[PDB]
Write a protein that binds this ligand. Structure first.
Ligand SMILES: [Zn+2]
Ligand SMILES: [Zn+2]
Ligand SMILES: [Zn+2]
Ligand SMILES: [Zn+2]
Ligand SMILES: [Zn+2]
Ligand SMILES: [Zn+2]
Lengths: 346, 346
């Protein structure tokens, strides 16, 4: 018999395998927040049709609890829509929020609020937001709501649904505390990279979501995504990847500080899959007559692929029910384990 | 207040990161024995002087509980000998054994019975075996005992220290039951690869060690190594790597089958470091006027280095005391955790 968390925060690092996680132990100032976790599990990430998953099927496994096809958003392998944790939470009177450093219409956040046959239908996904139960969102993607093929103003529709929308900057909590629902659309497409000065957006937005959704002592569910770790991987760009995962680890710290104080919040950290074959290899040196050799004293990160890979992925859990998340299991069981510990029903 | 194990089995997969472990989930018939574990931790593997560890310092972290320099065997950063878990076990009336698919003088097994300034001193290590507290061993390396540069017959010295030695094949338990100590030296250098017909040596030798070392109701400690996973990694040879870790997973099943029947046995599985940047990438499909594109349906393993890497490494533990091994910690704490749960006198 484990305990029962009131609140859940699910932090997803897109594209981070254990090698990416490990970079925080060598390239971050001070101890990584990962070290706060005791309960650790591993997930198998293959989709219903593919050994190597994409972000859409990978996140839909978390949000909806099923294996589905690569590119599916909140639909099953036979393409029928399935209820997401956000919808279920709403039925149980739980407040919900989604935060991402990509466009808010990108595959990972979209899987938590939309149902589409293909992740590329992002203007459809933006419109899906208007029929969702979500109470808070923050990320990029303003173009999908205001510069559309159908020339519709989706912000007006959201505002008609009780959203206050801010397209300028993340504000203090006092600026939003009295709003019924809140959305931040802070870039036309993706948010800036850390290297281009995104700064503390992910941690700040997560803190804002926590304070906003727990107004009046409501239970809440939040998914916050370190979206751009995956992009650093695809580009085989070590400094990009490293700076984005260090930022993610800051957000883990933000979530854990809240949870440890609150005492009734489960924090789950995981990834959808690994990307790039990122490796903390030994530094390579060149001679002059037969160049390359290794120096084990230092790390020179390397990559082996431009795409995703099928390694098992670590899961970290802290708070009431955290022991449910140990062992090795399929990615889609994350959904079922969350429902099990929270007792959120259908 | 954890349970106290009477016996401990430590299985080390040399060079297996989580990507290597994951290959057993795609390239092995049936389900991997890894899935039996619930308690999982992660270790940081850097040595006292180098971000990327070698096998000698990595194994010495486990056997002796200190960070030391790459190439060190059972000695501290200052080259002085340090008391090992095998030496502690012997002082606590525990029977001890070491099994490997490399030469028994290779860095991993040697760290559990020898004290040498440099792993390259394999003839010195073989002599150290003759003065060690080990009661059982099995592996390759007959050359280091009978075809030495110094021409000494160390086989005779082994036998003169109460070891019964077999250089022909592994036997059954009844054959060796009345022997005080048993050593198998079954190859001149390394044991054969799996691809060259090694068969179930690692499982069979571990099972034999368990039976031999538990004679007369004695408690035991065993370290058994899947030594050649590392060599597949160094060679960037997927099928070699995969066949060796599949064999290692069989050995895990052997240990766990004993532990579950026995009920007083802690089984710990970990690795010393990762090698090769082994990645379960998408299979590459070719056309002609476009050449190469990724097909996520299937996996095509890739590598990015010929050397070791500094990723954190998973630790799995089953049995009394196993909860001690969760969370994230330095590799050398493996030693201290084993000492803690067994309650042996230091
Ligand atoms: Zn992804
Ligand atoms: Zn994503
Ligand atoms: Zn991707
Ligand atoms: Zn090694
Ligand atoms: Zn080894
Ligand atoms: Zn090696």
């Amino acid at each position: 018999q484990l305990k029962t968390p009131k609140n859940v925060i699910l932090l997803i690092s897109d594209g981070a395998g254990l090698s990416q996680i490990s970079s925080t132990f060598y390239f971050k100032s001070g101890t990584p927040n990962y070290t706060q976790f005791k309960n650790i599990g591993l997930i198998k990430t293959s989709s219903s049709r593919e050994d190597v998953t994409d972000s859409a099927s990978g996140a839909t496994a978390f949000s909806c609890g099923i294996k589905t096809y690569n590119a599916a958003i909140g639909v099953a392998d036979d393409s029928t829509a399935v209820k997401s944790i956000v919808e279920i939470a709403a039925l149980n009177n739980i407040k919900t929020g989604v935060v991402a450093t990509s466009s808010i219409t990108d595959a990972t956040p979209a899987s938590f609020y939309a149902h589409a046959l293909n992740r590329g239908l992002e203007e459809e996904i933006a419109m899906d937001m208007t029929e969702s139960d979500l109470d808070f969102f923050a990320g990029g993607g303003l173009n999908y709501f205001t510069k559309r093929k159908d020339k519709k103003d989706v912000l007006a529709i959201l505002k008609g649904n009780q959203f206050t929308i801010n397209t300028t900057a993340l504000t203090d909590f006092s600026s939003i505390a009295s709003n019924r629902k809140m959305g931040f659309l802070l870039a036309d497409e993706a948010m800036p990279t850390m290297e281009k000065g995104r700064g503390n957006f992910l941690s700040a937005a997560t803190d804002l979501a926590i304070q906003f959704l727990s107004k009046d002592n409501s239970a809440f569910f939040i998914m916050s995504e370190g979206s751009q770790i995956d992009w650093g991987g695809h580009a085989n760009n070590a400094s990009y990847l490293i700076s984005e995962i260090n930022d993610f680890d800051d957000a883990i710290g933000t979530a854990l500080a809240f949870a440890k104080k609150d005492g009734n919040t489960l924090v789950i950290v995981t990834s959808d899959h690994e990307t790039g074959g990122f490796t903390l290899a030994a530094k390579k040196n060149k001679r002059e007559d037969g160049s390359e050799y290794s120096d084990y004293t230092e790390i020179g990160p390397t990559f082996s692929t431009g795409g995703h890979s099928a390694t098992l992925i670590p899961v970290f859990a802290y708070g009431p029910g955290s022991e449910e998340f140990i062992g090795i299991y399929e990615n889609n069981e994350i959904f079922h384990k969350i429902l099990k510990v929270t007792k959120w029903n259908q």
